[PDB]
Structure formats: C-alpha cells, structure tokens
C-alpha cells in the first residue's frame, strides 16, 4: 500500500505537491469546524444548509424500543 502512495511520485519535486507559494502550513484556516458563520460560511451554507440553530422540542430519555416498528408494503 505504501508503494502506491501519491507522495512517492513527488519524491524529488521540492514542494511535495503542496505549492511553492501557499506552502503546506498547519491549520491555516482553523481546526475542525472552526470558521462556520465567519470564514467557512460559504462552505457551510453551500453543502450543509440547515446546520446552525435548533428546531423542535426535546424528548428527554427516548427508549427507542417503545416506538420501534418496522414496516412492510
């Protein structure tokens, strides 16, 4: 598996495919889901529309066995 890796085919290419200009730094945009609503907001709204906020009422302890029912047509 390790001899099929794409980094192997950039072995003598200096930048390792990560750009001579932008470089490969560590977390240049933030960690995890950091920038939602601020600088990742386009990504969040374009791919995960209803992500932020809450809707509905709470069900405190669920006990899924109570409402479990499989269906057949």
């Amino acid at each position: 598996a390790t001899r099929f890796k794409k980094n192997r085919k950039k072995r003598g290419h200096v930048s390792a495919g990560h750009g001579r200009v932008g470089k490969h730094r560590k977390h240049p945009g933030g960690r995890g889901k950091a920038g939602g609503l601020h600088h990742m907001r386009i990504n969040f709204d374009k791919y995960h529309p209803g992500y932020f906020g809450k809707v509905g009422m709470r069900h405190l302890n669920l006990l899924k066995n109570r409402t479990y029912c499989p269906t057949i047509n």
Binding site: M40, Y47, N65, R66
Partner: protein
C-alpha cells in the same frame, strides 16, 4: 473544512493514545476459556457444568414475541415442580427470588421444563452404594447398575438450551 464532505465529528480531542487497545489474544483467550470449561467438566466428572435456566419472555414491545433463558426459576415454579429452592440449587437448577409468574402460561411452561429436567436426572449416591430417596424434591438416588449403565451414555445438553 473544504468541499462537500460530512461535517467532521471525531472525538479524539483528549489523550487517546493511552486508551487505544488491540485484542491480539482474541482466539488465544477463546482457547483458554475452552480449556478451562473442559477441565472443570472433567473435574466434576459426568455431571454437566451447565445449570438449568427458565424460559422467559424478553421485555418491551420490541422483543415481545421472543423468549430466552432467564436467571432462576421462581418459587412458584419450583413448588409446582415439587422442590424447594435450597434443594433445587444443589442439583444444577437456578433459582431467583425476584421474578414472579404474572401469567399461567409462563408458570406452566417453566414447571413442565423443570419436570422434564427432574425426570431426566439420575442421582449419584452421597455415600457410595448407600442410596437414599432424597429430600426437598430431589429425586431418589439411583443404584449401582443404572448409574454404571448411564455413565457411558451421551448426556443430553439440549435440555439446557
């Protein structure tokens, strides 16, 4: 994040390298458990290591229809079978003091199961050819000839299932 991916969710924000463990010994432990139960059935020598458990209905509407092995027969079930809990616990019959028979169907099904086990039992004398007729509902002691002729017959483990 970038592109159309699921929003990440990984709970690895603590020192997890200390808590990761790998089971290299899964089948080795399989063999060890097998050997242990083999040795503890050879040690008691003929009497099964399995104990009789009742048939009970799984709770909740999810598993309403399914039955499984409970722990311990009830006092009513044991009394219907004709034996006391203290006596029953000496012949491989589990007893639990918590369960109650809410329905005659469960009561009679577990009583019939207990009776089948009792009728399948053959009892070894406590004092080596001093056979007696037992107490607390324990069946009477079998004698030398039937014990010798049953000790070489395959014990039915299907009763415990």
């Amino acid at each position: 994040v970038a592109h159309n991916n699921v929003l990440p969710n990984v709970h690895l924000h603590k020192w997890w390298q200390r808590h990761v463990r790998v089971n290299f010994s899964k089948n080795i432990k399989k063999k060890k458990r097998r050997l242990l139960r083999e040795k503890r059935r050879k040690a008691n020598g003929g009497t099964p290591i399995e104990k009789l458990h009742p048939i009970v209905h799984c709770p909740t509407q999810r598993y309403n229809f399914r039955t499984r092995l409970g722990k311990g027969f009830t006092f009513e079930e044991l009394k219907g079978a004709g034996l006391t809990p203290r006596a029953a616990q000496t012949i491989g019959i589990c007893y639990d003091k918590r369960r109650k028979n809410r329905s005659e169907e469960s009561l009679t099904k577990n009583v019939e199961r207990l009776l089948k086990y009792k009728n399948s039992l053959v009892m070894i004398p406590l004092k080596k050819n001093k056979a007696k007729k037992g107490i607390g509902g324990i069946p009477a002691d079998a004698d030398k000839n039937t014990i010798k002729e049953f000790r070489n017959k395959k014990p039915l483990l299907s009763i415990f299932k």
